[PDB]
RNA sequence: UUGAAAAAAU
RNA sequence: AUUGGAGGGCAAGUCUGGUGCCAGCAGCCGCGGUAAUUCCAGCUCCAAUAGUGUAUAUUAAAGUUGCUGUGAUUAAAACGCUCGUAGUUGAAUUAAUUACUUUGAAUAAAAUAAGGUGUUUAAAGCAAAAUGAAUAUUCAAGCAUGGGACAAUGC
RNA sequence: ACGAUCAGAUACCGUCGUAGUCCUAACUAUAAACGAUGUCAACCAAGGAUUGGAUGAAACCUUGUUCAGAACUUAAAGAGAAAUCUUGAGUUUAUGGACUUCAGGG
């Protein structure tokens, strides 16, 4: 090793570089959210696969397993307040059933769309990047902000940002 | 229209409502119009176009061989092959064979019965020629981990999660789909633990309704 | 063979034809005169 | 029960069965026909059990009657030997069952496009050794078969086998006569309390 | 099968279901070692090795069983 | 020679079932063979069996009922830790709801399901679908 | 809503094994119950035989082990041949 | 009885 | 905002000028001898994007190094045959160690998986608005202990 | 070494003929040394016949049972790329009976 500070990757390119079925199925999602490139498709995919691993690994063990009680509940607990999983779904099996549209729907470009500020999802990029949007008490210029459940009634416009 | 077989008349006259009832008693579908009645809106796909040749005294008698796989995503799929001079006819000729060769696709669970079927019930292997395809159940999240050739067939059968291992000359596309179809074809032939009980007794559709077709 | 019979209870003739070591309970074919 | 005392073979019925040497089978004995053979003749020929022959014949006729009493045409009888045709056609007339006299055209049960395409639900063959083609067709249509099998004929694709001499001339007419009478007897069209008006010689070659 | 030849003989004595030295006999090796007069008999020179291999296998076992003294050794 | 008596018995049973036989014979009756059948009997994969005494490790007659798809012995019995169970289930069994392993432990010849509750490991003997 | 098993497969009475959906050699024999007067009745017993068993010369002998046991036959099969 | 050979890519 | 490409692998042109088996392209099959979908170029769009090709090398592909897991009649591959030491494997049976198996003890951190925490998100950091994860270990050995079915050691 | 045949023939065809072909002693250790199929063990469809014993009938021959050996025929079954194999080349992605040798594109 060289450096004491840690680093990590967020997106991995697909194994097959060319598929006619994997471009429309991406533009149908890229055009739905008005993203910039194809990284966020993989970045959301990488995040979903990350949490899918723990649930799949934990599901193999019995209910009385101590790690299932501790790590399994802590996985749902984080998944609950993040807004990915509705509160009424409280089983480890529902984590695998989650798709990539759930995490994409919690992006700030999608939350401000449903609040009534940007008519088009492409127009919301300027508002978030221009610092017109404040989440409670802090200005935000990162469109990929995944809000929590408590902050859903808390996104609103700022007050004459510089 | 105008069936010429005993089972065909029952389908036309609205006596058999479900295709699975035919699979129960081993009745062989001999008219492709039967499937077009009980299974409307069947998804369509052409696997490949392969040209074969025969050397003659004057030249080569080239013919086009078409593999098409059809089925509904609810647990039915088929596969048929036809060779003909015309490209359009080869697809049409394989259309009938695909309908003629329907088979149930048994699906099951992996972890628990929390809703709907997603994977195969148990491990299966397709006994094609050199190509052998093995089907392994997978958890809910995992998609169809397979080559582009059998994955497109597994989509039409309704299976959404599966693990596949392959062995042989998989670059032969004709044997690849044949192996995939063969593995699924014997899904209902493996006596698992949940099929021990005999169950109820049901009369055959061709015996309850035998008198209506006797006149 | 192919026509399965009762292995537990063979007929008297069935055990009178087979090899002595191949009977259900092997017994000698010799006596003491 | 399922086999009441009424269907016991009358001594008159046995009297004619031994008259035609029905019990006398071929020399070579198949492995599947050891049970039906009581012992061997002086010149090493199988002698069928007369009691077992009647018991199999009655069971064979019971299945045909239960299936030909609402759809008589669904039973198809084929005749292989050049002489066993007359008994087959007499069986066709007196029961309404469809019959094939001479050579069996291959693909008749499978080629639906063929004009002469029958789809029976029960096939009766007079000789499995000569009617192998008809028996082999049942493997593609899920149709059970009944055979007048002999001591050496291979019992492949047969479901009900009647141990009887199928190479002589009197026995061929007799067994089909016996089977025809029982089929009517089970149906109630001719009770056992009387004697059949037709005679055995009407079925002969 | 047999120890050396590929024969499979199954003839066995059959003790009923009711309850109411070889090393010396194998030295056969002496009788063959006849080889003095028939020197070209390569067949006997092969079976003699087979016989002597048997003796060295029984002696290898009778020593462990403590039936023969550990200084035992067969020779001509 | 007869290295493994259990291997001979299990292959005889699998061959008989595929041919559709009703009963099979096993010549050498060992305590491993007898208690192996009990694990299959407790799961109703066979009806019953009968040990016949012949004073020479007598024969065994087993009655089968159309259920044993395949029973196979395993090359020398690997030491299996309770954490190593999941590796063997994912390899030797078709599905998590169908198959069953057989392990010889200090608490007798158990299966994979009843050893997990018993909380013990042991050498793997075989499996039966 | 939907049912997880598309259909309940049959069971061959000879080997007590599942019947394949594409097994075209498997037959179904129906033998009818007879009354005291020796005249058949609508009630009958459904017998199924797997195709593989048929092609060996075994379907005939195996049914006699089922016919005699069920009472439809008396003395075709001896005692030691019954299991 | 004798019968050797037919330049390269299309 | 560039690179590579627009015959197949593999997404993208049945467009136009010359060259005429020559220049050349081409990772493999291949395109070029006068009407080139591949050459040198003109227009257009396909993949990625502050990234993008090449050359070399580790890994997966590779069930083409096999414990899981290969092949040996004919594709490569059973010694000409037998004896034989080391090595490996060894029938049923019984109502002092070792191995196996289960728990612990103790075992540097960093790193892997993570428990929490709006560095505004994220990489990060253990910080802040008292907490330090029990943090799970640790292959192979060593100590203690519950069990003796399968195993080896001679009585 | 001759005589033919041939464009040539130093070969096939004909005649003659040294080593060799045979035995003894000592070397040599290779063959398409092949069943191109290692050795030991368990299971395994149907049939005729054969070599050598044993056991009943029949007064070397015919016939029943059984053991060991060289083999043969049928299969809608099993395996395989197929040819074919079945006293295995079957019991194998449903992959593990024991051991040894050998192979890694040309």
PDB file of N, CA and C (backbone and C1' of nucleotides) in Angstrom, chain A residues 4-8 18 23 36-39 50 54 67 70-71 74 77-78 138-142 145 148, chain I residues 10-12 46-51 110-118 120-125 133-134:
ATOM      1  N   UNK A   4      -2.450   6.193   3.405  1.00  0.00           N
ATOM      2  CA  UNK A   4      -3.247   5.779   4.553  1.00  0.00           C
ATOM      3  C   UNK A   4      -4.730   6.072   4.360  1.00  0.00           C
ATOM      4  N   UNK A   5      -5.067   7.136   3.637  1.00  0.00           N
ATOM      5  CA  UNK A   5      -6.466   7.449   3.377  1.00  0.00           C
ATOM      6  C   UNK A   5      -7.054   6.458   2.380  1.00  0.00           C
ATOM      7  N   UNK A   6      -8.291   6.045   2.631  1.00  0.00           N
ATOM      8  CA  UNK A   6      -8.946   5.027   1.825  1.00  0.00           C
ATOM      9  C   UNK A   6      -9.677   5.649   0.639  1.00  0.00           C
ATOM     10  N   UNK A   7      -9.880   4.832  -0.391  1.00  0.00           N
ATOM     11  CA  UNK A   7     -10.626   5.221  -1.579  1.00  0.00           C
ATOM     12  C   UNK A   7     -11.424   4.023  -2.070  1.00  0.00           C
ATOM     13  N   UNK A   8     -12.428   4.298  -2.900  1.00  0.00           N
ATOM     14  CA  UNK A   8     -13.287   3.247  -3.424  1.00  0.00           C
ATOM     15  C   UNK A   8     -13.881   3.691  -4.752  1.00  0.00           C
ATOM     16  N   UNK A  18     -21.547  -4.083 -25.879  1.00  0.00           N
ATOM     17  CA  UNK A  18     -22.502  -3.689 -26.913  1.00  0.00           C
ATOM     18  C   UNK A  18     -23.708  -4.615 -26.875  1.00  0.00           C
ATOM     19  N   UNK A  23     -29.409  -0.317 -24.441  1.00  0.00           N
ATOM     20  CA  UNK A  23     -29.355   1.111 -24.723  1.00  0.00           C
ATOM     21  C   UNK A  23     -30.722   1.769 -24.631  1.00  0.00           C
ATOM     22  N   UNK A  36     -26.825  12.997 -16.941  1.00  0.00           N
ATOM     23  CA  UNK A  36     -25.759  13.516 -17.790  1.00  0.00           C
ATOM     24  C   UNK A  36     -25.082  12.419 -18.607  1.00  0.00           C
ATOM     25  N   UNK A  37     -24.728  11.309 -17.966  1.00  0.00           N
ATOM     26  CA  UNK A  37     -24.019  10.223 -18.630  1.00  0.00           C
ATOM     27  C   UNK A  37     -24.597   8.900 -18.137  1.00  0.00           C
ATOM     28  N   UNK A  38     -23.890   7.811 -18.429  1.00  0.00           N
ATOM     29  CA  UNK A  38     -24.335   6.472 -18.073  1.00  0.00           C
ATOM     30  C   UNK A  38     -23.728   5.967 -16.772  1.00  0.00           C
ATOM     31  N   UNK A  39     -22.954   6.796 -16.068  1.00  0.00           N
ATOM     32  CA  UNK A  39     -22.367   6.360 -14.804  1.00  0.00           C
ATOM     33  C   UNK A  39     -23.432   6.181 -13.729  1.00  0.00           C
ATOM     34  N   UNK A  50     -24.947  -3.712  -3.681  1.00  0.00           N
ATOM     35  CA  UNK A  50     -24.237  -3.733  -2.408  1.00  0.00           C
ATOM     36  C   UNK A  50     -25.158  -4.166  -1.274  1.00  0.00           C
ATOM     37  N   UNK A  54     -25.973  -8.227   1.355  1.00  0.00           N
ATOM     38  CA  UNK A  54     -26.142  -8.508   2.780  1.00  0.00           C
ATOM     39  C   UNK A  54     -27.438  -9.271   3.026  1.00  0.00           C
ATOM     40  N   UNK A  67     -26.649 -12.886  14.189  1.00  0.00           N
ATOM     41  CA  UNK A  67     -26.310 -11.854  13.216  1.00  0.00           C
ATOM     42  C   UNK A  67     -27.527 -11.423  12.407  1.00  0.00           C
ATOM     43  N   UNK A  70     -29.293  -8.817  14.478  1.00  0.00           N
ATOM     44  CA  UNK A  70     -28.555  -7.562  14.588  1.00  0.00           C
ATOM     45  C   UNK A  70     -28.316  -6.919  13.223  1.00  0.00           C
ATOM     46  N   UNK A  71     -27.642  -7.635  12.320  1.00  0.00           N
ATOM     47  CA  UNK A  71     -27.302  -7.050  11.026  1.00  0.00           C
ATOM     48  C   UNK A  71     -28.520  -6.976  10.113  1.00  0.00           C
ATOM     49  N   UNK A  74     -30.640  -4.056  11.225  1.00  0.00           N
ATOM     50  CA  UNK A  74     -29.928  -2.817  10.925  1.00  0.00           C
ATOM     51  C   UNK A  74     -29.926  -2.520   9.432  1.00  0.00           C
ATOM     52  N   UNK A  77     -33.443  -1.203   8.912  1.00  0.00           N
ATOM     53  CA  UNK A  77     -33.542   0.089   9.583  1.00  0.00           C
ATOM     54  C   UNK A  77     -32.940   1.197   8.729  1.00  0.00           C
ATOM     55  N   UNK A  78     -31.763   0.946   8.150  1.00  0.00           N
ATOM     56  CA  UNK A  78     -31.179   1.911   7.224  1.00  0.00           C
ATOM     57  C   UNK A  78     -32.012   2.026   5.953  1.00  0.00           C
ATOM     58  N   UNK A 138     -29.413  23.846   4.780  1.00  0.00           N
ATOM     59  CA  UNK A 138     -28.166  23.857   4.029  1.00  0.00           C
ATOM     60  C   UNK A 138     -28.466  23.931   2.540  1.00  0.00           C
ATOM     61  N   UNK A 139     -27.684  24.736   1.821  1.00  0.00           N
ATOM     62  CA  UNK A 139     -27.823  24.788   0.373  1.00  0.00           C
ATOM     63  C   UNK A 139     -27.220  23.524  -0.233  1.00  0.00           C
ATOM     64  N   UNK A 140     -27.781  23.092  -1.360  1.00  0.00           N
ATOM     65  CA  UNK A 140     -27.377  21.853  -2.011  1.00  0.00           C
ATOM     66  C   UNK A 140     -27.125  22.136  -3.485  1.00  0.00           C
ATOM     67  N   UNK A 141     -25.963  21.707  -3.980  1.00  0.00           N
ATOM     68  CA  UNK A 141     -25.629  21.811  -5.394  1.00  0.00           C
ATOM     69  C   UNK A 141     -25.337  20.453  -6.022  1.00  0.00           C
ATOM     70  N   UNK A 142     -25.622  19.361  -5.320  1.00  0.00           N
ATOM     71  CA  UNK A 142     -25.362  18.008  -5.795  1.00  0.00           C
ATOM     72  C   UNK A 142     -26.706  17.365  -6.140  1.00  0.00           C
ATOM     73  N   UNK A 145     -28.429  13.924  -4.367  1.00  0.00           N
ATOM     74  CA  UNK A 145     -28.738  13.871  -2.942  1.00  0.00           C
ATOM     75  C   UNK A 145     -29.943  12.966  -2.709  1.00  0.00           C
ATOM     76  N   UNK A 148     -33.806  11.585   3.088  1.00  0.00           N
ATOM     77  CA  UNK A 148     -34.348  10.613   4.021  1.00  0.00           C
ATOM     78  C   UNK A 148     -35.864  10.778   4.122  1.00  0.00           C
TER      79      UNK A 148
ATOM     80  P     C I  10     -20.328  -9.727 -29.920  1.00  0.00           P
ATOM     81  O5'   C I  10     -21.036  -8.643 -30.844  1.00  0.00           O
ATOM     82  C5'   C I  10     -21.927  -7.680 -30.292  1.00  0.00           C
ATOM     83  C4'   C I  10     -21.824  -6.354 -31.006  1.00  0.00           C
ATOM     84  C3'   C I  10     -22.006  -6.414 -32.520  1.00  0.00           C
ATOM     85  O3'   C I  10     -22.632  -5.212 -32.968  1.00  0.00           O
ATOM     86  C1'   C I  10     -19.860  -5.562 -32.016  1.00  0.00           C
ATOM     87  P     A I  11     -24.218  -4.997 -32.791  1.00  0.00           P
ATOM     88  O5'   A I  11     -24.325  -3.744 -31.807  1.00  0.00           O
ATOM     89  C5'   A I  11     -25.529  -2.995 -31.683  1.00  0.00           C
ATOM     90  C4'   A I  11     -25.329  -1.567 -32.126  1.00  0.00           C
ATOM     91  C3'   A I  11     -24.984  -1.396 -33.599  1.00  0.00           C
ATOM     92  O3'   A I  11     -26.158  -1.264 -34.384  1.00  0.00           O
ATOM     93  C1'   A I  11     -23.406  -0.223 -32.265  1.00  0.00           C
ATOM     94  P     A I  12     -26.174  -1.668 -35.936  1.00  0.00           P
ATOM     95  O5'   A I  12     -25.800  -0.315 -36.685  1.00  0.00           O
ATOM     96  C5'   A I  12     -26.422   0.915 -36.339  1.00  0.00           C
ATOM     97  C4'   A I  12     -25.530   2.076 -36.691  1.00  0.00           C
ATOM     98  C3'   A I  12     -24.874   1.987 -38.061  1.00  0.00           C
ATOM     99  O3'   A I  12     -25.709   2.471 -39.098  1.00  0.00           O
ATOM    100  C1'   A I  12     -23.226   2.456 -36.433  1.00  0.00           C
ATOM    101  P     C I  46     -26.822   7.714 -33.813  1.00  0.00           P
ATOM    102  O5'   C I  46     -25.736   6.650 -33.337  1.00  0.00           O
ATOM    103  C5'   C I  46     -25.876   5.277 -33.669  1.00  0.00           C
ATOM    104  C4'   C I  46     -24.712   4.453 -33.174  1.00  0.00           C
ATOM    105  C3'   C I  46     -24.221   4.749 -31.769  1.00  0.00           C
ATOM    106  O3'   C I  46     -25.031   4.154 -30.770  1.00  0.00           O
ATOM    107  C1'   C I  46     -22.373   4.497 -33.236  1.00  0.00           C
ATOM    108  P     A I  47     -25.056   4.757 -29.282  1.00  0.00           P
ATOM    109  O5'   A I  47     -23.646   4.338 -28.669  1.00  0.00           O
ATOM    110  C5'   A I  47     -23.357   2.983 -28.354  1.00  0.00           C
ATOM    111  C4'   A I  47     -22.047   2.857 -27.616  1.00  0.00           C
ATOM    112  C3'   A I  47     -21.746   3.963 -26.617  1.00  0.00           C
ATOM    113  O3'   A I  47     -22.369   3.738 -25.367  1.00  0.00           O
ATOM    114  C1'   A I  47     -19.849   3.588 -27.980  1.00  0.00           C
ATOM    115  P     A I  48     -22.739   4.970 -24.408  1.00  0.00           P
ATOM    116  O5'   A I  48     -21.335   5.437 -23.821  1.00  0.00           O
ATOM    117  C5'   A I  48     -20.573   4.575 -22.988  1.00  0.00           C
ATOM    118  C4'   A I  48     -19.191   5.127 -22.747  1.00  0.00           C
ATOM    119  C3'   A I  48     -19.133   6.564 -22.256  1.00  0.00           C
ATOM    120  O3'   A I  48     -19.341   6.668 -20.860  1.00  0.00           O
ATOM    121  C1'   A I  48     -17.586   6.265 -24.022  1.00  0.00           C
ATOM    122  P     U I  49     -20.174   7.898 -20.249  1.00  0.00           P
ATOM    123  O5'   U I  49     -19.127   9.095 -20.226  1.00  0.00           O
ATOM    124  C5'   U I  49     -17.854   8.941 -19.617  1.00  0.00           C
ATOM    125  C4'   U I  49     -16.871   9.952 -20.145  1.00  0.00           C
ATOM    126  C3'   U I  49     -17.308  11.404 -20.053  1.00  0.00           C
ATOM    127  O3'   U I  49     -17.069  11.961 -18.772  1.00  0.00           O
ATOM    128  C1'   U I  49     -16.484  10.962 -22.226  1.00  0.00           C
ATOM    129  P     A I  50     -17.791  13.325 -18.329  1.00  0.00           P
ATOM    130  O5'   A I  50     -16.612  14.396 -18.333  1.00  0.00           O
ATOM    131  C5'   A I  50     -15.572  14.341 -17.361  1.00  0.00           C
ATOM    132  C4'   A I  50     -14.381  13.559 -17.860  1.00  0.00           C
ATOM    133  C3'   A I  50     -13.104  13.722 -17.039  1.00  0.00           C
ATOM    134  O3'   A I  50     -12.344  12.516 -17.105  1.00  0.00           O
ATOM    135  C1'   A I  50     -12.719  14.465 -19.244  1.00  0.00           C
ATOM    136  P     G I  51     -12.634  11.292 -16.103  1.00  0.00           P
ATOM    137  O5'   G I  51     -12.182  10.013 -16.938  1.00  0.00           O
ATOM    138  C5'   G I  51     -13.115   9.285 -17.723  1.00  0.00           C
ATOM    139  C4'   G I  51     -13.142   9.773 -19.151  1.00  0.00           C
ATOM    140  C3'   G I  51     -12.711   8.772 -20.211  1.00  0.00           C
ATOM    141  O3'   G I  51     -13.750   7.876 -20.564  1.00  0.00           O
ATOM    142  C1'   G I  51     -11.692  10.875 -20.621  1.00  0.00           C
ATOM    143  P     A I 110      -7.523  -0.849  13.791  1.00  0.00           P
ATOM    144  O5'   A I 110      -6.862  -0.445  12.397  1.00  0.00           O
ATOM    145  C5'   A I 110      -6.431   0.885  12.150  1.00  0.00           C
ATOM    146  C4'   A I 110      -5.500   0.959  10.965  1.00  0.00           C
ATOM    147  C3'   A I 110      -6.070   0.490   9.634  1.00  0.00           C
ATOM    148  O3'   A I 110      -6.870   1.465   8.987  1.00  0.00           O
ATOM    149  C1'   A I 110      -3.979  -0.528   9.968  1.00  0.00           C
ATOM    150  P     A I 111      -8.305   1.062   8.382  1.00  0.00           P
ATOM    151  O5'   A I 111      -7.980  -0.099   7.338  1.00  0.00           O
ATOM    152  C5'   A I 111      -7.369   0.187   6.087  1.00  0.00           C
ATOM    153  C4'   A I 111      -7.163  -1.063   5.268  1.00  0.00           C
ATOM    154  C3'   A I 111      -8.413  -1.875   4.958  1.00  0.00           C
ATOM    155  O3'   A I 111      -9.150  -1.375   3.856  1.00  0.00           O
ATOM    156  C1'   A I 111      -6.750  -3.315   5.781  1.00  0.00           C
ATOM    157  P     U I 112     -10.754  -1.460   3.856  1.00  0.00           P
ATOM    158  O5'   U I 112     -11.069  -3.021   3.786  1.00  0.00           O
ATOM    159  C5'   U I 112     -10.929  -3.746   2.572  1.00  0.00           C
ATOM    160  C4'   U I 112     -11.525  -5.132   2.675  1.00  0.00           C
ATOM    161  C3'   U I 112     -12.987  -5.202   3.095  1.00  0.00           C
ATOM    162  O3'   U I 112     -13.887  -4.993   2.018  1.00  0.00           O
ATOM    163  C1'   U I 112     -11.727  -6.715   4.401  1.00  0.00           C
ATOM    164  P     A I 113     -15.163  -4.028   2.189  1.00  0.00           P
ATOM    165  O5'   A I 113     -16.150  -4.842   3.139  1.00  0.00           O
ATOM    166  C5'   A I 113     -16.990  -5.871   2.632  1.00  0.00           C
ATOM    167  C4'   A I 113     -17.801  -6.498   3.739  1.00  0.00           C
ATOM    168  C3'   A I 113     -18.673  -5.531   4.532  1.00  0.00           C
ATOM    169  O3'   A I 113     -19.943  -5.334   3.941  1.00  0.00           O
ATOM    170  C1'   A I 113     -17.354  -6.787   6.024  1.00  0.00           C
ATOM    171  P     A I 114     -20.364  -3.885   3.400  1.00  0.00           P
ATOM    172  O5'   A I 114     -20.354  -2.967   4.701  1.00  0.00           O
ATOM    173  C5'   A I 114     -21.454  -2.958   5.600  1.00  0.00           C
ATOM    174  C4'   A I 114     -21.073  -3.533   6.941  1.00  0.00           C
ATOM    175  C3'   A I 114     -21.614  -2.803   8.161  1.00  0.00           C
ATOM    176  O3'   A I 114     -22.954  -3.150   8.462  1.00  0.00           O
ATOM    177  C1'   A I 114     -19.312  -3.243   8.461  1.00  0.00           C
ATOM    178  P     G I 115     -23.910  -2.091   9.197  1.00  0.00           P
ATOM    179  O5'   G I 115     -23.467  -2.169  10.725  1.00  0.00           O
ATOM    180  C5'   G I 115     -24.403  -2.502  11.739  1.00  0.00           C
ATOM    181  C4'   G I 115     -24.406  -1.470  12.837  1.00  0.00           C
ATOM    182  C3'   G I 115     -24.517  -0.025  12.380  1.00  0.00           C
ATOM    183  O3'   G I 115     -25.855   0.362  12.122  1.00  0.00           O
ATOM    184  C1'   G I 115     -22.772  -0.224  13.964  1.00  0.00           C
ATOM    185  P     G I 116     -26.181   1.459  10.995  1.00  0.00           P
ATOM    186  O5'   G I 116     -25.993   2.849  11.750  1.00  0.00           O
ATOM    187  C5'   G I 116     -26.621   3.088  13.000  1.00  0.00           C
ATOM    188  C4'   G I 116     -25.930   4.194  13.758  1.00  0.00           C
ATOM    189  C3'   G I 116     -25.739   5.495  12.999  1.00  0.00           C
ATOM    190  O3'   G I 116     -26.901   6.307  13.010  1.00  0.00           O
ATOM    191  C1'   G I 116     -23.715   4.896  14.068  1.00  0.00           C
ATOM    192  P     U I 117     -27.235   7.261  11.762  1.00  0.00           P
ATOM    193  O5'   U I 117     -26.194   8.457  11.905  1.00  0.00           O
ATOM    194  C5'   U I 117     -26.127   9.225  13.097  1.00  0.00           C
ATOM    195  C4'   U I 117     -24.845  10.015  13.171  1.00  0.00           C
ATOM    196  C3'   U I 117     -24.547  10.910  11.981  1.00  0.00           C
ATOM    197  O3'   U I 117     -25.259  12.135  12.021  1.00  0.00           O
ATOM    198  C1'   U I 117     -22.609   9.685  12.546  1.00  0.00           C
ATOM    199  P     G I 118     -26.517  12.370  11.048  1.00  0.00           P
ATOM    200  O5'   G I 118     -25.860  12.823   9.672  1.00  0.00           O
ATOM    201  C5'   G I 118     -25.406  14.158   9.487  1.00  0.00           C
ATOM    202  C4'   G I 118     -24.770  14.342   8.133  1.00  0.00           C
ATOM    203  C3'   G I 118     -24.277  15.756   7.834  1.00  0.00           C
ATOM    204  O3'   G I 118     -23.098  15.688   7.031  1.00  0.00           O
ATOM    205  C1'   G I 118     -25.896  15.129   6.230  1.00  0.00           C
ATOM    206  P     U I 120     -19.547  19.921   3.998  1.00  0.00           P
ATOM    207  O5'   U I 120     -20.865  19.051   3.796  1.00  0.00           O
ATOM    208  C5'   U I 120     -21.913  19.072   4.753  1.00  0.00           C
ATOM    209  C4'   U I 120     -23.251  18.875   4.093  1.00  0.00           C
ATOM    210  C3'   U I 120     -23.325  17.751   3.072  1.00  0.00           C
ATOM    211  O3'   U I 120     -23.513  16.477   3.664  1.00  0.00           O
ATOM    212  C1'   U I 120     -24.284  19.704   2.157  1.00  0.00           C
ATOM    213  P     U I 121     -22.474  15.288   3.367  1.00  0.00           P
ATOM    214  O5'   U I 121     -23.381  14.113   2.796  1.00  0.00           O
ATOM    215  C5'   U I 121     -24.710  14.360   2.362  1.00  0.00           C
ATOM    216  C4'   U I 121     -24.950  13.799   0.984  1.00  0.00           C
ATOM    217  C3'   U I 121     -23.982  12.717   0.533  1.00  0.00           C
ATOM    218  O3'   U I 121     -24.323  11.437   1.035  1.00  0.00           O
ATOM    219  C1'   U I 121     -24.280  14.305  -1.207  1.00  0.00           C
ATOM    220  P     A I 122     -23.205  10.491   1.697  1.00  0.00           P
ATOM    221  O5'   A I 122     -22.155  10.251   0.525  1.00  0.00           O
ATOM    222  C5'   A I 122     -22.504   9.502  -0.629  1.00  0.00           C
ATOM    223  C4'   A I 122     -21.342   9.407  -1.582  1.00  0.00           C
ATOM    224  C3'   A I 122     -19.989   9.163  -0.933  1.00  0.00           C
ATOM    225  O3'   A I 122     -19.766   7.794  -0.649  1.00  0.00           O
ATOM    226  C1'   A I 122     -19.811  10.934  -2.491  1.00  0.00           C
ATOM    227  P     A I 123     -18.873   7.354   0.611  1.00  0.00           P
ATOM    228  O5'   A I 123     -17.383   7.444   0.061  1.00  0.00           O
ATOM    229  C5'   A I 123     -17.020   6.788  -1.144  1.00  0.00           C
ATOM    230  C4'   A I 123     -15.711   7.309  -1.677  1.00  0.00           C
ATOM    231  C3'   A I 123     -14.583   7.417  -0.668  1.00  0.00           C
ATOM    232  O3'   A I 123     -13.947   6.174  -0.428  1.00  0.00           O
ATOM    233  C1'   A I 123     -14.690   9.397  -1.955  1.00  0.00           C
ATOM    234  P     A I 124     -14.248   5.358   0.924  1.00  0.00           P
ATOM    235  O5'   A I 124     -13.027   5.730   1.871  1.00  0.00           O
ATOM    236  C5'   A I 124     -13.208   6.587   2.987  1.00  0.00           C
ATOM    237  C4'   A I 124     -12.665   7.968   2.719  1.00  0.00           C
ATOM    238  C3'   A I 124     -12.173   8.724   3.943  1.00  0.00           C
ATOM    239  O3'   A I 124     -10.853   8.370   4.317  1.00  0.00           O
ATOM    240  C1'   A I 124     -13.621  10.113   2.719  1.00  0.00           C
ATOM    241  P     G I 125     -10.585   7.604   5.703  1.00  0.00           P
ATOM    242  O5'   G I 125     -10.973   8.673   6.815  1.00  0.00           O
ATOM    243  C5'   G I 125     -10.120   9.770   7.107  1.00  0.00           C
ATOM    244  C4'   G I 125     -10.717  10.647   8.177  1.00  0.00           C
ATOM    245  C3'   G I 125     -11.089   9.941   9.473  1.00  0.00           C
ATOM    246  O3'   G I 125      -9.982   9.812  10.349  1.00  0.00           O
ATOM    247  C1'   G I 125     -12.900  11.285   8.754  1.00  0.00           C
ATOM    248  P     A I 133     -14.139   1.537  17.656  1.00  0.00           P
ATOM    249  O5'   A I 133     -14.226   0.115  16.942  1.00  0.00           O
ATOM    250  C5'   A I 133     -15.398  -0.288  16.241  1.00  0.00           C
ATOM    251  C4'   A I 133     -16.641  -0.135  17.084  1.00  0.00           C
ATOM    252  C3'   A I 133     -16.979  -1.290  18.019  1.00  0.00           C
ATOM    253  O3'   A I 133     -16.187  -1.279  19.205  1.00  0.00           O
ATOM    254  C1'   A I 133     -18.915  -0.648  16.828  1.00  0.00           C
ATOM    255  P     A I 134     -16.758  -1.654  20.668  1.00  0.00           P
ATOM    256  O5'   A I 134     -17.577  -3.007  20.482  1.00  0.00           O
ATOM    257  C5'   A I 134     -18.615  -3.341  21.395  1.00  0.00           C
ATOM    258  C4'   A I 134     -18.527  -4.773  21.867  1.00  0.00           C
ATOM    259  C3'   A I 134     -17.378  -5.600  21.308  1.00  0.00           C
ATOM    260  O3'   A I 134     -16.150  -5.387  21.987  1.00  0.00           O
ATOM    261  C1'   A I 134     -19.386  -6.816  21.095  1.00  0.00           C
TER     262        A I 134
END
